[PDB]
Amino acid sequence: EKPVYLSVKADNSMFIGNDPVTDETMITALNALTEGKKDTTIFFRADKTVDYETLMKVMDTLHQAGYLKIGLVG
Amino acid sequence: KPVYLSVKADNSMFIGNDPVTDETMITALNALTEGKKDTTIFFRADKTVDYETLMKVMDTLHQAGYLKIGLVG
């Protein structure tokens, strides 16, 4: 299970690896990489100015889909 | 008992109800935890707190050995 890097830009645009995603498309895009393997490590990176509301919305979408192995990258 | 670390929108910081800064946070935390690094830390922040600030706090805890972290939304 190669880890997946989820990036959030300062304008709140979002990426799974290189793939642009939205809240509505994130889990479908992620499942293509993980093949549904919920034990896949997800690394979250974000621009310095990304706010906690945005972080936690992303976190909750992952959480509700069963993606619980999360590492924050600074 | 779990410890609640709060960050406000002006970036002021609290452990429980106790104001802390980056330089005083670990001493304040150790008073609550008696040094038990397995103590659960719940992080809460106002919506506008930014990722740089979050990760600064996370890194101070991390380097002190506090690794049981839950983010509260």
């Binding site: 690394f43 590492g71 924050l72 | 972290i69």
Partner: peptide, 9 residues
Amino acid sequence: QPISVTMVT
């Protein structure tokens, strides 16, 4: 509600 996180660097 909590989301457990590791920090990695």
